[PDB]
Amino acid sequence: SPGIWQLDCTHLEGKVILVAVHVASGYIEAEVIPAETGQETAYFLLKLAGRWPVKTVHTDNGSNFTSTTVKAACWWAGIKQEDGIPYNPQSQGVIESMNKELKKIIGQVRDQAEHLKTAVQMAVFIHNHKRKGYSAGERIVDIIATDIQ
Amino acid sequence: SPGIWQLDCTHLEGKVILVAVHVASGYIEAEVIPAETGQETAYFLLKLAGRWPVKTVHTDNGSNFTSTTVKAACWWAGIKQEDGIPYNPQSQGVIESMNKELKKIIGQVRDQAEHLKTAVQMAVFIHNHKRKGYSAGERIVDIIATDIQ
Numbered sequence A, B: 001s002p003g004i005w006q007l008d009c010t011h012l013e014g015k016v017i018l019v020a021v022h023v024a025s026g027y028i029e030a031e032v033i034p035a036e037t038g039q040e041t042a043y044f045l046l047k048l049a050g051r052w053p054v055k056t057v058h059t060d061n062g063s064n065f066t067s068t069t070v071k072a073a074c075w076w077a078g079i080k081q082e083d084g085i086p087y088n089p090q091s092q093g094v095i096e097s098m099n100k101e102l103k104k105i106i107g108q109v110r111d112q113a114e115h116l117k118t119a120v121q122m123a124v125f126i127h128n129h130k131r132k133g134y135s136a137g138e139r140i141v142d143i144i145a146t147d148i149q
């Protein structure tokens, strides 16, 4: 489980927000794209895996699970690509809650930037620094450092 | 020490690659932009500081040191913005070497993707995972984990 991430795609302002959550910590990275394609999802996973030791990804839907470009990036980066089926139903709920909480934060900051993408990165920052006690950013570093050592 | 990063801007294919290096580990994040502006540097620093606990940044040149947009982002994210002057000249030489090494990796992958931005993220991945013995990605997590405790 230190290597497990989940993809999640949510919509705001006619645009798509692609999120990766590190399931054990709650830590996230996110970006805005005009629409979810395999091309964009593949690039996002390549960025993530160069930054954190991503071993497994639960993909967000069957189009990205099937996408040959996503499978190419998962092969390149050494990621085991998995489906995203909430074989555990508390999964659907945790992700829904995250999207509602991210959108709330986005609305709390939205007036401080012109572009949605800036607001989304402000919300990533506030989410990862929030203590709840340790923050998600502290949790992920502690988890992965324990895994190394 | 655990919160110190250095900005570095290098050029390839008529484009600019903006790099942040975590000085104690060598770990990097990077992006391709059409040219270095305060706007893009500000956005890049907001992304970085949402993902790692960025306390101090040595800016790469005086235009980004002066930029009011850069200063806004550093204020928003809680980053101490510093000049980039190698009061220790070892610094310049280290950054030069990194740019040469990154360009070398980029050339090694360049034919595997159409777009430079993809090649640069492949190079970020190879650089962060290279063991030296620990990799930069391992060093950064160990340093920050040690700091949290």
Ligand SMILES: O=C1Cc2ccccc2/C1=C\c1ccc2c(c1C(=O)O)OCO2
Binding pocket: A039, A040, A042, A043, A046, A069, A072, A073, A074, A076, A077, B112, B113, B114, B115, B116, B118, B119
């Ligand atoms: O062919 C491959 C192998 C590979 C391995 C890992 C990641 C990407 C690619 C990849 C292509 C590609 C994919 C998405 C992109 C993208 C490109 C590109 O060709 O630059 O550009 C932006 O989003």
Ligand SMILES: O=C1Cc2ccccc2/C1=C\c1ccc2c(c1C(=O)O)OCO2
Binding pocket: A128, A129, A130, A131, A135, A136, A137, A138, A141, B049, B050, B051, B052, B053, B144, B148
């Ligand atoms: O260790 C990590 C990795 C990480 C990734 C993303 C965000 C924060 C962190 C982080 C630590 C942290 C450090 C100093 C702070 C701070 C926090 C925090 O609250 O997250 O809050 C104020 O000064």
Ligand SMILES: O=C1Cc2ccccc2/C1=C\c1ccc2c(c1C(=O)O)OCO2
Binding pocket: A112, A113, A114, A115, A116, A118, A119, B039, B040, B042, B043, B046, B069, B072, B073, B074, B076, B077
């Ligand atoms: O005014 C502020 C306060 C602030 C605080 C933190 C980061 C950005 C901003 C910021 C503006 C901004 C800056 C760069 C951008 C950007 C925008 C934007 O307005 O969306 O869009 C992409 O690069």
Ligand SMILES: O=C1Cc2ccccc2/C1=C\c1ccc2c(c1C(=O)O)OCO2
Binding pocket: A049, A050, A051, A052, A053, A144, A145, A148, B128, B129, B130, B131, B135, B136, B137, B138, B141
């Ligand atoms: O702990 C971290 C944080 C980090 C950030 C970026 C890249 C790697 C790492 C990393 C660990 C790591 C884990 C498993 C590996 C591996 C490495 C590595 O070599 O970096 O190499 C192959 O299997």
